[PDB]
Amino acid sequence: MVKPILYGIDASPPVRAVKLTLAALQLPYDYKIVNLMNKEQHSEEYLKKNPQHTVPLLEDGDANIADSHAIMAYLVSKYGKDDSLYPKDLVKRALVDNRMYFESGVVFANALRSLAKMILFLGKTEVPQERIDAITEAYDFVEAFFKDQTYVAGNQLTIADFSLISSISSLVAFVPVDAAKYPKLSAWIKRLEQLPYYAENSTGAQQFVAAVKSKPFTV
Amino acid sequence: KPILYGIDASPPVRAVKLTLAALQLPYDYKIVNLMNKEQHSEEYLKKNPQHTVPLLEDGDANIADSHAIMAYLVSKYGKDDSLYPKDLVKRALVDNRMYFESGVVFANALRSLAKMILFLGKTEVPQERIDAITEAYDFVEAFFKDQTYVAGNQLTIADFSLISSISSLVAFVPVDAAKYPKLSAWIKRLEQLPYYAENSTGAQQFVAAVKSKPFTVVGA
Ligand SMILES: N[C@@H](CCC(=O)N[C@@H](CS)C(=O)NCC(=O)O)C(=O)O
Ligand SMILES: N[C@@H](CCC(=O)N[C@@H](CS)C(=O)NCC(=O)O)C(=O)O
Numbered sequence: 020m021v022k023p024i025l026y027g028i029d030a031s032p033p034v035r036a037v038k039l040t041l042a043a044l045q046l047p048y049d050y051k052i053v054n055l056m057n058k059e060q061h062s063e064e065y066l067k068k069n070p071q072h073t074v075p076l077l078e079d080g081d082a083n084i085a086d087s088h089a090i091m092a093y094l095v096s097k098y099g100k101d102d103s104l105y106p107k108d109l110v111k112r113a114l115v116d117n118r119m120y121f122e123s124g125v126v127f128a129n130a131l132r133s134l135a136k137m138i139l140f141l142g143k144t145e146v147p148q149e150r151i152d153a154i155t156e157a158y159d160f161v162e163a164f165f166k167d168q169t170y171v172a173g174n175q176l177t178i179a180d181f182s183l184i185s186s187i188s189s190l191v192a193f194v195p196v197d198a199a200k201y202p203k204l205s206a207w208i209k210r211l212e213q214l215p216y217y218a219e220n221s222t223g224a225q226q227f228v229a230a231v232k233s234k235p236f237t238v
Numbered sequence: 239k240p241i242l243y244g245i246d247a248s249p250p251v252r253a254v255k256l257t258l259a260a261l262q263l264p265y266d267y268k269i270v271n272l273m274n275k276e277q278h279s280e281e282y283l284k285k286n287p288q289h290t291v292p293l294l295e296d297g298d299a300n301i302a303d304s305h306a307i308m309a310y311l312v313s314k315y316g317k318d319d320s321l322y323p324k325d326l327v328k329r330a331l332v333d334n335r336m337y338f339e340s341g342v343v344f345a346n347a348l349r350s351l352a353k354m355i356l357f358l359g360k361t362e363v364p365q366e367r368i369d370a371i372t373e374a375y376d377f378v379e380a381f382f383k384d385q386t387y388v389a390g391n392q393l394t395i396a397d398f399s400l401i402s403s404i405s406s407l408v409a410f411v412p413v414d415a416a417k418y419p420k421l422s423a424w425i426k427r428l429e430q431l432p433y434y435a436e437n438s439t440g441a442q443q444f445v446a447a448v449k450s451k452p453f454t455v456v457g458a
Contacts, residue, residue: 070380071338071377071380082327082330084327084330084331084334085334086333086334086337086338088333088337089330089331089333089334089337090330092329092330092333093326093327093329093330093333096326096329097326109310109313109314110299110301110310112309112310113299113301113306113307113309113310114301114306116303116305116306116309116310117301117302117303117306119337120303120305120306120336120337120340121288121303123337123340123341123345124340124341124344124345124346124349125345127341128340128341128342128345128346129345129346129349129350132346133346160287160288163287163288
């Protein structure tokens with residue numbers, strides 16, 4: 020009976036996407052803190068587990084999986100007692116995959132990580148307008164995802180919603196979501212806030228926001 | 239036949255083209271010229287509001303994102319799963335490497351620089367954009383260990399994803415074969431595939447487009 024181990028810290032958006040998924044699956048697991056501020060991802064012990072020095076990492080028995088999106092797909096496929104969260108139908112799965120690849124690059128790499136690195140790590144107090152533009156571009160794209168639908172990848176909650184909420188709920192540290200401009204995006208956030216296990220995201224999202232607010236900058 | 243929307247110079251388009259060739263799946267190819275802003279036409283925006291390529295239409299289905307498209311293609315049309323294994327541990331590694339490509343390689347290192355130079359008319363590139371490329375090469379060199387592919391001992395769609403972007407990044411930073419012997423050997427391995435010209439043709443066009451827009455790098 021495998022109980023997996025998750026490595027991470029709650030402030031990290033992709034770690035929170037995996038925390039939401041584990042909670043949705045009601046799957047017990049051990050959680051090991053990798054304090055990124057203590058540069059703990061660069062330890063010799065952790066670099067053996069993950070040469071990319073990133074979190075989250077999941078150890079599942081003898082398996083070692085990095086990347087929140089790979090981890091979430093793996094978790095649902097192995098332990099999911101239905102497949103609503105990651106449907107087996109190929110066209111619907113492709114939409115969930117598409118939305119997670121979108122989160123990986125357009126949201127996380129291009130908008131979030133870039134700006135967070137500048138502010139939280141490099142101590143910059145001025146950032147170019149393009150870093151703010153990356154954020155509003157992401158919001159604009161996600162607003163358009165909804166159409167006549169409730170969630171980012173269909174009419175059911177999927178791991179793509181967990182992926183995208185983890186980062187969008189972090190980006191609001193930099194640019195709050197204008198509810199008038201983004202009504203569908205705002206409603207979707209409100210909907211997810213009502214999940215019984217949403218604190219697996221909101222606690223760390225609030226920590227991320229607090230860390231960002233303590234490092235002011237101009238543009 | 240499936241329909242693929244793209245242009246050969248685009249890296250993620252070329253990852254899909256490689257996949258289609260590997261699968262021997264005939265398709266209609268519709269060229270969307272990005273330099274002429276054809277992705278912003280009323281008709282293309284209807285098909286894909288993100289105005290991106292590649293886009294695949296298959297019957298009444300629509301799939302965007304090269305990595306989503308490739309996984310779908312192998313799972314739907316592959317005669318076996320070698321290019322995208324059904325085993326969950328093996329699949330997770332392929333997924334991991336494609337997610338890595340999408341963010342660390344494509345969004346962070348390639349698209350950033352290419353948009354600046356090719357589309358936005360900038361000639362001054364911060365040293366940070368060059369650092370983002372060498373970081374990527376360092377990460378990929380480390381994937382191999384004793385294996386010959388990025389996601390295990392057999393060719394997978396993760397190889398097609400990473401070669402499409404790495405073969406474009408050399409426009410900016412040629413791969414030092416002394417520093418990156420495994421990455422170099424892997425490129426040479428893929429170059430042997432009978433259908434590799436589905437990547438090399440457009441990669442050369444990408445390189446040519448970059449050489450036509452001279453730039454300098456700024457920063458210690
Ligand atoms: N998109 C990747 C992101 C992984 C990532 O970059 N995690 C950051 C924390 S938000 C990290 O580990 N930074 C530590 C480092 O790069 O050294 C995923 O979904 O897992
Ligand atoms: N994550 C996507 C990237 C798609 C993408 O950014 N495509 C570029 C071409 S390299 C594009 O369509 N640019 C046109 C635009 O954004 O308007 C994938 O793997 O397919």
